[PDB]
Every structure is written in C-alpha cells, then in structure tokens.
A paper describes a structure:
Flavin‐dependent halogenases are potentially useful biocatalysts for the regioselective halogenation of aromatic compounds. However, there are a number of flavin‐dependent tryptophan halogenases that can regioselectively halogenate free tryptophan, and therefore have more potential for synthetic purposes. Previously, X‐ray structures have been elucidated for the tryptophan 7‐halogenases, PrnA9 and RebH,10 as well as a tryptophan 5‐halogenase PyrH.11 These structures provided insights into the mechanism and regiocontrol of flavin‐dependent halogenases. It is suggested, that the halogenases utilise O2 to oxidise FADH2 giving C4a‐hydroperoxyflavin, which then reacts with chloride to produce HOCl.
From this, we found that SttH from Streptomyces toxytricini gave good expression in Escherichia coli and catalysed the halogenation of tryptophan to give exclusively 6‐chlorotryptophan. The X‐ray structure of SttH was then determined at 2.7 Å to reveal a dimer, with each monomer exhibiting a box and triangular pyramid structure, as previously observed with PrnA, RebH and PyrH. Within the box structure are the conserved flavin‐dependent tryptophan halogenase sequences GxGxxG and WxWxIP. At the interface with the triangular pyramid, are the catalytic residues K79 and E363, which align with the active‐site lysine and glutamate of PrnA and PyrH. In addition, SttH residues H96 and F98 are positioned for π‐stacking with the indole moiety of the substrate, whilst the P97 carbonyl and Y463 hydroxy groups can potentially hydrogen bond with the indole NH. From sequence alignments it is evident that SttH is more like PyrH than PrnA, with insertions present in PyrH and SttH between residues SttH 155 and 167 and a deletion between SttH 457 and 464 compared with PrnA. Other than residues between SttH G148 and G167, which lack electron density in the SttH structure, the only differences evident in the active‐site region between the structures of PyrH and SttH are those of PyrH residues F451, E452 and T453 and SttH L460, P461 and P462. These residues are of particular interest because they are in close proximity to the active site in PyrH and SttH, and are positioned directly above the α‐amino acid moiety of the substrate, tryptophan. Each of these residues was mutated in SttH to the corresponding residue in PyrH, that is, L460F, P461E and P462T. Interestingly however, the triple mutant SttH L460F/P461E/P462T exhibited similar activity to the wild‐type SttH, with tryptophan as a substrate, but produced 32 % 5‐chlorotryptophan (1 b) and 68 % 6‐chlorotryptophan, whereas the wild‐type SttH only produces the 6‐chlorinated product.
Numbering used by the authors:
A (entry chain A): 4 to 152, 158 to 519
B (entry chain B): 6 to 146, 171 to 519
Write the structure that this text describes.
Amino acid sequence: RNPDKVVIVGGGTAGWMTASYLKKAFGERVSVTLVESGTIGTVGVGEATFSDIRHFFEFLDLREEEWMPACNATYKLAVRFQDWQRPGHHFYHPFEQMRSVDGFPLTDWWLQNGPTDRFDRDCFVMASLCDAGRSPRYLNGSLLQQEFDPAGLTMSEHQGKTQFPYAYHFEAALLAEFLSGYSKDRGVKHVVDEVLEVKLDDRGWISHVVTKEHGDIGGDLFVDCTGFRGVLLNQALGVPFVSYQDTLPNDSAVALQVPLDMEARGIPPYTRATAKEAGWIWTIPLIGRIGTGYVYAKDYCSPEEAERTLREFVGPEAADVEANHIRMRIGRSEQSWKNNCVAIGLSSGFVEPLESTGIFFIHHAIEQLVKHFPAGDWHPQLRAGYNSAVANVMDGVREFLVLHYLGAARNDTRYWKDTKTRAVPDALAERIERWKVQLPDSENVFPYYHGLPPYSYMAILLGTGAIGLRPSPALALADPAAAEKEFTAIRDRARFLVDTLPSQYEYFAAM
Amino acid sequence: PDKVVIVGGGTAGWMTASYLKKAFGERVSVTLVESGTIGTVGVGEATFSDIRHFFEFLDLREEEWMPACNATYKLAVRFQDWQRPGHHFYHPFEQMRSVDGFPLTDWWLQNGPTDRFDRDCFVMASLCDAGRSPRYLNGSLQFPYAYHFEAALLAEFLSGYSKDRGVKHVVDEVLEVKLDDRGWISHVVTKEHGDIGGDLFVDCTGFRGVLLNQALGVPFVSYQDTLPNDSAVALQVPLDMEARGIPPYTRATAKEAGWIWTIPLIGRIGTGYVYAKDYCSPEEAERTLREFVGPEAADVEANHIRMRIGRSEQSWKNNCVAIGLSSGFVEPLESTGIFFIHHAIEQLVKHFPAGDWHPQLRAGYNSAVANVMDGVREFLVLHYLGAARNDTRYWKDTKTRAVPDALAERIERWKVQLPDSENVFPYYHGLPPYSYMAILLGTGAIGLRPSPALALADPAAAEKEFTAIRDRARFLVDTLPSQYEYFAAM
Ligand SMILES: Cc1cc2nc3c(=O)[nH]c(=O)nc-3n(C[C@H](O)[C@H](O)[C@H](O)COP(=O)(O)OP(=O)(O)OC[C@H]3O[C@@H](n4cnc5c(N)ncnc54)[C@H](O)[C@@H]3O)c2cc1C
Ligand SMILES: Cc1cc2nc3c(=O)[nH]c(=O)nc-3n(C[C@H](O)[C@H](O)[C@H](O)COP(=O)(O)OP(=O)(O)OC[C@H]3O[C@@H](n4cnc5c(N)ncnc54)[C@H](O)[C@@H]3O)c2cc1C
Ligand SMILES: [Cl-]
Ligand SMILES: [Cl-]
C-alpha cells in the first residue's frame, strides 16, 4: 500500500524523460527521486528526434505552444542524406506513410515507370516541402490544411498509422531543464550530488546509492541514467557490454554550436546527413543557431583533421567556436534490466546518430518500463519481456544503419571502400538478396519491433543506390492507370502546399 | 500473354480464376479445367475477417452476390461449453481498445465490471447475444465482419463472374500430368479435349493434390500430432429461420469427442461434427449430430469427410502452385479455409512469375503461405490447451498430448505478460494479439494476471471506457433490427 520508490541516477535527457514520464503515468502512487552530479556534465548533444517523438509530448499532456519556444525547437519532416550515392545529389527519408496502389507500394510502381528520377519526390509529399523549406503548418497552427480542425495511440501504433509522424529539432539542455520543471512541479525529488558507491545486498540486488553529502539514498527500483559510464548496471552489477564496432566502425564525433542569422539562411525542416571522407556530418537547425557535428572513424581520420574538416564545412562562422570531442560507446548491454536496476539512455546502449534514434531508445525504454513495471514479487517473465523488447529495438536499428553503408554508392576513399569488405551478419546478407528481387515488406525485414517500417528500408535502398532493385513482374502486366493518378495526386498536393505554406521562421515569428 | 491453367473448380479454383482475371485481365489468359464426375468437398460456409477485401477487389457490392448465395453476416464465433456446461464467449471481429497504453482486456483483468470479458470489452458481443443485425433496415452501419454463405452457390456465381471476363472453361477429367526435362509441367492430358498447356499451373484439386503432391511428389507435413481431429460429418438442414432467428455468428459447441459447428444461412443451417476417430466412430458421430439438431435433421443426407490435416512442404514447386485444400488444411474452428485461399491468391498476384522465374519470388510465396498455416495451427492448439472442459477421455488427452516447444514457452509468457505484438507468432497469420486474449480468457484453463502497473494506475480512464462500450451496446441492441428482419426487408 506504500508507494514504490524509484531512484533515478543521472540528470541528462534520459533521466528527466524517465522522471517526468514515470510521474505522469503513476502520479503520487509512485515516489520518484532523481540524483544527479553537479560536477559531471551531460553529453551536450542529442538534438534531433525520430518519428516516435510526438507520442512522448502527448503522453506528458504538453502542447507545442508550451515547450517548443523554451527549447528553440523546430520541425523535422525528414533526414536529408547528402552525397551518399554521388557528389551533388540528395534524397529524403521522410516521416510519411507509404501509399500503395492495388496491393503494391508506390516505390514498386516507381521502379516500373516512375515520373521523375527522384523516388522521394514522386512518392512522398514531404520531399517537396523539404526542398522548398516549408513549414508543415500554416500561420494558424493548421497542419497541412488551410482551414483548422488528439488520438490515443501508443508509440508503436502512432508511427504506424499516423500519416505524417514528423519530429523535432531542439536544444538537448533546454529540454532537460524544461522536463526538470515538469517533474518537480509534480513531486519529483531532486538531489544534486555525486554517487560514490552502489551498495548491494546479500543476494546481489541494489540496496542504496551512497552519495557524498546526502548519505544513503534507498529505494525499490533504481534507474541508471549515468550515460556511457553505466555506473549502476555495467559497473556495479557488472552487466557486460557488447560492441557494434565490427559492423559500424564510427567511434568518434566532434560537434559545434554555431549561432547564425536564421533568416537569410532559412530554417530547413529536416536534419541533413552529408557523407564525408571518413564518415558523415550532421546539420541540425534550431531557433537562432545550427548544431553541426562530424561522426567519423578515427582509424580513417585523426581528431585534429576531423575538427578542421568540420570547421571548413560550416565556414567562417564556425572558425573560433568551441569544438566538443566525444568518444562514443557503440553497442548495447547484454541485458538492460538486472535485478532491481534498469538502464535507460546511453547506459543501455548507443548507435551513431545517422537516423537520430538516441532519444527514441529512451522513449521506448520508459514506455516499456511502465508496461513491464514491477510491484509484486518481480516475476522473471516481466524482466525478460523488457530486455527482449529493448534489445530487439537496438538490434533492428543496427541492421538498418549498416544498410546505409552497404547501400552507399560512394566509393572514393579507403573508408568507403572498406564499407563493402567489412563482414556483415548472415541475417542481413540474406534479406538484401530478398530485397534485390522482392522490395522490402512486412515479412522480409527484422521480425520484431524496432521503429523502422518497410518504407524506411525502401527509401535507403533506393536513395543510396549501390544495391540494385527490381520492380515485381506483376506490375509489367498491370494497368498503370490508378498508379499514375496517385502519382499525379501527390504531385498536385505538393504543388499546392509549396505555394501556400510559410517558411518556419515566418511560422515561429507569429508566436 | 502469360498462360495460367487452373485444375479444379470448387471455390479454390474459381476464387483463383476470378481474382487473377480482375487483377490482370486480357494481359493474362486463364483456363479452368474441372471434373464433371468428381464433386466438391463440399462444405466451407463461414469466413474470416479478410473476406470483405476479397469482394471489394472483385468490385462486388454486397447486394450483387449475397442474395445469390443465401449469405448472412458473421460478427463473431460463439464458443459454447468449452470451459463449463452452459457457458459461452465470443471471439469477435472487433478491434481491441487501449487505455493509457494497455489493452482493455488488461484493465478487465485488473478490475472488470462483469465476469464476462467479451461483453465488457467488445460491443458486438452484446449484438450477438441479442441476435442483432450489424446493419439497420435502411442499410446504415474498425469492424471487419465476415459472412456465412453456401459455398456451392458462390462457386457458380464466381464461374459466371470469371467467364464474363474471358476465363476459358473446360469440363473434363485430367487424366495425366506430363513433366518435361527439368521436371516442370508441359501440359495436362484431358479425356477428350486433348492436351492443355500453359506457363503456370494451379493445383486446386482438393485433398487429392493431383498436380503438386502426386505429379511432382511434394511431401505433406501432418499437423495431426497436435490436432487429432481427422474426421467430420456434415448436414444441411432447411429451417424456418424466422422462428428461432438468424444468429449473427458461427457457433462452435464443444462435444464429447470434438465440436459441432452451426452456420446460419438464408432458409437453412450448415452444421457438422468435427471429431477424432479414436474417440468416436463415423456412425455415432452421425448419431450425435442428428440428436443435436433434432427431428428437422432426421432424413437429410449426411456428408462424411476424411480430413487431411497439415500442409504441403512447399506450395509452389517449379511452375505449379497449389491453392485450397491441395495446399493444406486445419479444422474449421476459426473458419480459416477460404482465408487461406484468399491469402494465397493475393500472394500469387504479388509473387507472380511474369518475369523468368526468379527463385526468390517462389521462396517468398512459400514462406508467406507456410507461416500463415503454422501460425493458425498454433492458434488452434491454444483452443484445446485452454479449454477447461475435462469430462471425457478426449478432453483429458488435450492436456497430455504433444505441444510445440515454441507454443509451450510463449504460453508461460502469456500467463504473466499477456498476448501482445511481440510475444505471439512473429509472422503474419491473420490473427492479431487480441484474438489470443479472447481464447485464453474464454476457454479458462490457463490463468492470467493483469499487469502489475495497473494496480498503481488511475482507473478513471478505464472505467469510463467500459461504460462507453456498455452504453453504445445498450443503444445498438435497442435500435438495431433482427438479422432476419433485415433480409426479409431486402
Ligand atoms: C555525438 C553524439 C551525438 C548524438 N546525436 C543524437 C541525435 O541526433 N538525436 C537523438 O535523439 N540522440 C542523439 N544522441 C544521444 C543523446 O544525446 C542521448 O541519448 C541523450 O541526449 C543523453 O542521454 P544520457 O542522459 O544517458 O547521457 P549523459 O548526458 O552522459 O547523462 C549522464 C548524467 O548522469 C550523471 N552522472 C554520471 N555519473 C554520475 C554519478 N556517479 N553520480 C551522479 N550522477 C552521475 C551525470 O552528471 C549526467 O547528469 C547523440 C549522442 C552522442 C554522444
Ligand atoms: C468439414 C470441413 C469443414 C470446413 N469448414 C469451413 C468453414 O467453415 N469456413 C471456410 O472458410 N472453409 C471451410 N472448409 C474448407 C473449404 O471447404 C475449402 O477451402 C473450399 O470450400 C474448397 O476448397 P478446394 O477447391 O481446394 O476442395 P475441392 O472442393 O475438393 O476442389 C476439388 C475440385 O477439383 C476437381 N478435381 C479433382 N480432381 C480432378 C482431376 N483429376 N481432374 C479434373 N478435376 C479434378 C474436382 O472435380 C473439384 O471440382 C471446410 C472443409 C472441410 C473438409
Ligand atoms: Cl541518435
Ligand atoms: Cl476452415
């Protein structure tokens, strides 16, 4: 009858997303205490989200009016992949549902007889808005419809049935500060101190966390949000961490924060991923500045050269700003939940920000935490269900990311030559063989949930260009009519939206 | 044009012929060869949640085909006496509702109003108990309801539909299937129409499997080690449906050595006894069925059937694809027979070999077909593993029989975790997570727990949703007409 006590260790994005979500879900029925270090800094990045993100704010009962201005937040409709196939060309991976004609996806029709040479513009409306720098909403908060006009879906069904599950760019520090206010206004205890030790009982479970100036803080469930450190799960409980470095070599990153005149430049409604000599560079647009970073493998490029490459790429306005060098831990823990300790965030695992899935992992974890929340005698099946769910999301996204590099047609430097000599898991090698003949569907991809629908695999395959696809033979005998009218309908609405929608700065100037 | 030759014309063949001709047409040539001495099986009266998409693909409105086939509506399947004598529950064609991330059945396990989950969580469960029509007397209406109909009448209707679009029809005996060098099919030899050749051959010859199983020697994987029901005896009983109404559902009444189906049609009921030989002989299986229906079924002829339970090792070999009973079959507990056909012909259009036969296309089709069979099979075993009835030797053996290691493990999860999208059969097999919920909750031999989180959650949003369902049901029952009144008007 006494409220279960949850102790959260870490004041990063993971920690406050957990505290606010847990407190919103259970209210005063659950006591939440968040302990964070005052000397240890947060990772400083993580500023683009995934198609899942809208569900998180809806669960928190937060409208865009309340949180977006305080975080310098902007809209994200897609990820623009630049120069991944050949110099000077780009394609979008949009957060938009794939339309089908007579049981066949529009991309399959596009392979038979597509209008233009860009699959993304023909099959996705969002690709036209991105190329025009358009805001998804008119000057009155009206989404893609001039006149005005919610939904109770879970996270998975949101990104599965919502036609336009767009995302956001935002400052990772401002969001954490906002969620700290959201949490503390709902009864979340805040303790700023260092956790010196994790005291375990006789049976190996966490008894309490030993702080320096606040004594022993105990509880029933301990949540590790200490980042790459893994203070509780990896260090204290000794849960082994498995690396993904063998399939995804990128281990390093260097990032800047560049204040720019977001007016002459404009605010592009997407994250850009420009392919480079030893990796790729991200461009995350915000209100007032852009967040840019070079994700690379240091075996192909020195940290010194990587920073200079990044500064040249942005230009003179980034010549003197501080550069943040990060050594990434790529992979995941063998299990994210052992005994009474569950890791959420960088402590659980991480893959390179190629598709901005970092915050997605956190969002998925806390949702699965509520779903598999213990209150009785802790049934092993509950913990097993959580660990398999979290691992499948990680393992699935990892396949999707390797596919980016196996599909890349770029082949100039040693880094991009080695991307095809590197050994892949046998599972993905077989699906690629299936995908060459049978364009990816719900039955030839990774079987368990991992946030990626078939049209995502379609977009990366069609856009990166090295893996040749074919249109299914049935479309050579089908009446192309209906498909050509669907192609026309997409082109028509796109032309209407581009000519009627405002830029983002215009939208954000109108409060 | 690509030449497709279909052997067999008993629902499997005509659904294939009409679907292909509507999908492609003129750019594909279809020839159907059916025996004029060998008949259809000839049952298959109830359908599944997929069936509406089939008629929509054929561009057929309900009024075009339903009266011609004596068709009625199927809102659910009523499982009777599977847990205890006199108790029943429904497995409806209605989406499960979610409150704060948890399915309504999970909330019901925590603090449900009534002792009947189906009445609390499903609206149509109230309509079934009240014998309501899903449509008003003026045609008004996610509810993927199915149909009951005469399989014989639908076959003739589709034949007309097929031949009205260029499907070449031949009535003759296929006496031989001649194989070329590779082992593919050159042509089939008829009795007096000569050889009929083509590029693709479709085996729809039923349990015989003349083309796939006999001519090409594709092995058959038996499911009888986990599903012993191998026999069936069926009747067609003309009735004054006005007196006792037309139920908007298929009933599955558990019996001493199996179960009995009751399929309501226009002017008659389709009913049969699915059973296992070791527990019941065909003669007393007939006796039981007649006593179950009554004096109205004392003189009507009885159709005895030896069922082949399982699936072919592969349904597509070389240039031959088997569709229907030739591909595989499981007992009609959930009416998945025509669903298997509808799925197969849809996969056939998807994996159509208009291109010069890539092995990956054939591999994809066989995987889709096999997993639907394996998934449904797992779902049907759950009916018997979950059934609390324990009176006869037949029902006691359902708890000592062999159980797939995969099933046994995810059952142990379901007892705690409850069926979701991540702990069921991971590939498409027509059954959503809420279908598994209904069977477990209804049959009652397998106990379940609510999620421990719901003990700490605010019930307000859930209690509101239960009330919203009961209110909508109360209104619908009071305003909707009988299913009989509906068809009597139209
Ligand atoms: C280069 C890089 C780029 C990224 N890009 C993206 C992106 O584009 N989109 C996206 O969604 N995600 C991205 N991510 C991931 C994202 O940044 C993280 O998931 C999130 O921002 C922070 O997760 P975290 O709190 O676990 O990490 P951290 O910021 O490291 O959290 C650590 C917290 O725990 C505290 N702490 C640590 N040890 C102790 C201790 N003994 N005692 C007390 N407190 C302690 C620390 O003080 C700190 O508050 C990126 C990550 C990196 C490294
Ligand atoms: C007891 C029982 C109950 C069932 N209940 C349901 C239900 O409730 N709901 C549902 O959806 N499905 C049900 N089914 C399945 C359903 O009956 C079938 O899916 C469908 O109705 C018939 O499939 P078929 O054409 O492959 O079989 P068949 O009817 O046997 O087709 C055989 C055809 O091929 C011809 N033929 C055979 N050999 C030759 C030859 N050498 N040469 C030329 N022609 C040949 C025959 O003349 C015949 O026309 C049930 C099946 C059984 C046995
Ligand atoms: Cl990321
Ligand atoms: Cl069936």
